[PDB]
């Protein structure tokens, strides 16, 4: 699940690019991983 | 450990900065606050600040006269007394109150890369420097 | 605006007591975070609850919390000399400030 937000820009639109917070794991399988990402719209869903 | 530390005997009018060096876990990810006490009174609460300082509540008695601020590198935590006055006569203590520590589905969820976070409370709380405001 | 408690109460020893912190329903009546430090004289305060019921590792079981409405009460049961100190509720409010109790002078009777 990511939780992700119209990418910043001043207006005048009418996106595509989301800045993407979830969370996440890393190496060590017990501790995990909060993150952020820039996707392009045509690789997610909501 | 936090060394709250800054505070003197200084006049009404004048200026300090406060200190809260933290120690005994990572301060760089953790949300603080000023508390004052005149002596004697009640714990006239000061500021509030953001894990990584963005967010910077006040109230507003002392406000923007006590402005807090902080360093995540450092490990301390600051509050920029500006105009002082006799009502900043009072004892500077150092709180953490927001977050919890994301131990969820049975594992520890973290933020930007195993942080600690907030704890609800302190492991340590504050000790009170004490600034006093006299004519 | 500061959280109205109480000036004092007092108590003879394994007396039962109650402390009263009224608030907004924008502090105290919307939020979960109430909690409450006990302090001596010229010491630190020490949380003895938060979270409005729920008591620190290392804290007597004779102190409760509890709350109704915009009011707040922490209770100790069987009042013990070490008992006696200033009581302050501390809240969480709409903006994410805290704010401070006006405080409790707790008077364990010599």
């Known amino acids: 699940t990511l939780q992700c937000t119209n990418v910043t820009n001043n207006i005048t639109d009418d996106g595509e690019l989301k800045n993407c917070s979830f969370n996440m794991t890393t190496e060590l399988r017990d501790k995990k991983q909060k993150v952020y990402s820039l996707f392009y719209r045509l690789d997610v869903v909501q | 450990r936090l060394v709250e530390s800054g505070g003197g005997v200084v006049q009404p009018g004048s200026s300090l900065r406060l200190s809260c060096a933290a120690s005994?876990?990572?301060?760089?990810?953790?949300?603080m606050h000023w508390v004052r006490q005149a002596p004697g009174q009640g714990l006239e609460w000061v500021a509030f600040?953001?894990?990584?300082?963005?967010?910077?509540y006040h109230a507003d008695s002392v406000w923007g006269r006590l402005s807090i601020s902080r360093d995540n590198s450092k490990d301390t935590l600051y509050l920029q007394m500006n105009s002082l006055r006799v009502e900043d006569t009072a004892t500077y203590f150092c709180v953490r109150e927001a977050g919890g520590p994301d131990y969820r589905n049975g594992y520890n969820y973290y933020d930007f890369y195993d942080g600690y976070y907030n704890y609800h409370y302190m492991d340590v709380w504050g000790k009170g420097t004490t600034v006093t405001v006299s004519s | 605006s500061a959280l109205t408690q109480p000036a004092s109460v007092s108590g003879s020893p394994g007396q039962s007591i109650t402390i009263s912190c009224q608030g907004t329903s924008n502090d105290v009546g919307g939020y979960e975070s109430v909690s409450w430090y006990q302090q001596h004289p010229g010491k630190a305060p020490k949380v003895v609850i938060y979270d409005v019921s729920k008591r620190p590792s290392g804290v007597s079981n004779r102190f409760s919390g509890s709350k109704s409405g915009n009011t707040a009460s922490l209770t100790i049961s069987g009042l013990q000399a070490e008992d006696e100190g200033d009581y302050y509720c501390?809240?969480?409010?709409?903006?994410?400030?805290?704010?401070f109790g006006t405080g409790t002078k707790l008077t364990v009777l010599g």
């Open positions: 005994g876990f990572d301060f760089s990810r953790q949300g």
């Open positions: 600040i953001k894990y990584d300082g963005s967010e910077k």
């Open positions: 501390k809240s969480l409010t709409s903006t994410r400030r805290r704010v």
